[PDB]
Design a protein around this ligand. Structure first.
Ligand SMILES: NS(=O)(=O)c1nc2ccccc2s1
Ligand SMILES: NS(=O)(=O)c1nc2ccccc2s1
Ligand SMILES: [Zn+2]
Length: 257
């Protein structure tokens, strides 16, 4: 029902998901003048050594690379987090042109795309119970700037022809998500929400300060995907980003000075 087009785009979501006007919506602009260093924060612990990728799926809004989350195999700990969050999937949001596509912005600067590695708090047992809790998810957000190609990303860009349309999926095993991480894990953190419907306010956002680089050829391949299913009228999957929502009564913390 909902989408990114002009008649079903983010400005409409509130009529079916009233939480769209809640007080902890994502994404937001990260005002680095206002963000507050908190040297009580811990270092993030990203353990993806045993990550087990299963499959890549075009879901009509973006593409997800899904992981086996049935055990504590790839988990995120530390930082602002209490307890252990299991990786379930990653996906990206991106623009029709290089100067837009990211969902978070940094001092109003937009990046060409953003990667979200989605993880859920193991104290809730499964992902569907976790989304109903204010501390249920932790999403690691990583900006993409256009520059020199990312080898770790090429493996994702090479399978996209096989999931070109909505509902198509392809086996995608032995993919190592470590190859999508920048050198530094310095970050900003704030309490927020899912950025697509149901827009639930269940997310601790951890947004990395250092972007990764992707080539112009690589982000071109994202923009060749289709929102529509096979058979249907072609609608390029581009601009599948929600714009920044009001910070309201929230503090963004920084792991670094
Ligand atoms: N509120 S919404 O889920 O974004 C939505 N917008 C529209 C527009 C036309 C038809 C159905 C929906 S459902
Ligand atoms: N874009 S996001 O905030 O990482 C995200 N949104 C949603 C909505 C429904 C189910 C999974 C996710 S993960
Ligand atoms: Zn996302």
């Amino acid at each position: 029902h909902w989408g990114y087009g002009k008649h079903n785009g983010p400005e409409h979501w509130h009529k079916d998901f009233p939480i769209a006007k809640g007080e902890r919506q994502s994404p937001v602009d990260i005002d680095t003048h206002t963000a507050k260093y908190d040297p009580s924060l811990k270092p993030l612990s990203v353990s993806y050594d045993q990550a087990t990728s299963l499959r890549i799926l075009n879901n009509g809004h973006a593409f997800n690379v899904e992981f086996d989350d049935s055990q504590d195999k790839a988990v995120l700990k530390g930082g602002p987090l209490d307890g252990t969050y299991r990786l379930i999937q990653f996906h990206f949001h991106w623009g029709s042109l290089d100067g837009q596509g990211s969902e978070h912005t940094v001092d109003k600067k937009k990046y060409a795309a953003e990667l979200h590695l989605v993880h859920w708090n193991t104290k809730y047992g499964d992902f569907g119970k976790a989304v109903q809790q204010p501390d249920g998810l932790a999403v690691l957000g990583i900006f993409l700037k256009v520059g020199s190609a990312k080898p770790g990303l090429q493996k994702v860009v090479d399978v996209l022809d096989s999931i070109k349309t909505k509902g198509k999926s392809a086996d995608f095993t032995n993919f190592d998500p470590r190859g999508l991480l920048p050198e530094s894990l310095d970050y900003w953190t704030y309490p927020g929400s899912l950025t697509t419907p149901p827009l639930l306010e269940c997310v601790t956002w951890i947004v990395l300060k250092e972007p990764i680089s992707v080539s112009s050829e690589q982000v071109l391949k994202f923009r060749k995907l289709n929102f529509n299913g096979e058979g249907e009228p072609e609608e390029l999957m581009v601009d599948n980003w929600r714009p920044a929502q009001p910070l309201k009564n929230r503090q963004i913390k920084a792991s670094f000075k």
